[PDB]
């Protein structure tokens, strides 16, 4: 059985315009482990993105954290794009600073 990933995009610290921060895309509850996560800024890929090592939960479903440095502004739009065998097309989740 294959399980589709849950996706949360958020900042490490409360976002303040002009203050350096970290943009996170946390994917969890998916199976199998092969997955692609991209961070997006104003409609294009953010090049340098790192991720945590592969681990899994009690139900054996994997989880990963993708993160990069960023500085939020009032007009810059951020998002995350996730691709998995359970998805017919890559799914995009936008970043809401209040979520």
């Amino acid at each position, epitope marked *: 059985i294959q399980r589709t990933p849950k996706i949360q995009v958020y900042s490490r610290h409360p976002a303040e315009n002009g203050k350096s921060n970290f943009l996170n895309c946390y994917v969890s509850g998916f199976h199998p482990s092969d997955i692609e996560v991209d961070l*997006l800024k*104003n*409609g294009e*890929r953010i*090049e340098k993105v790192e991720h945590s090592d592969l681990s899994f939960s009690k139900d054996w479903s994997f989880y990963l954290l993708y993160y990069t440095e960023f500085t939020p502004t009032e007009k810059d739009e951020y*998002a995350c794009r996730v*691709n998995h065998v*359970t998805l*017919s097309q*890559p799914k995009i989740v936008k970043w809401d600073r209040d979520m």
Partner: nanobody
Amino acid sequence: EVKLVESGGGLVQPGGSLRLSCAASGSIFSINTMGWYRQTPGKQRDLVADISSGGSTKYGDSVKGRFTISRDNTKNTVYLQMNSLKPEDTAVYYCYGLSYSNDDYWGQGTQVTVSS
């Protein structure tokens, strides 16, 4: 909002070349990244190549060195030059685009078959 019109798919021999194109109609100039994904039945769609309005490109590992993407921002058209085609390149090639607000758009896809 944005409509993507693709062309150029079809049958080609192993070791041959093929040139795909994709133009954006409508609310164009609101599209940043454009590119191609490919998909076989039952599986997900994998990245082939894309390019931003600034020219930043990314290629899938299996197509790096054989495919080349180019772009004309004045008419919002991207071109995919596929060289040294292999039977594993057989798939449906979907054009896509991202607005500057990270809204994604897709075309209907074009079939590419590499067979003897």
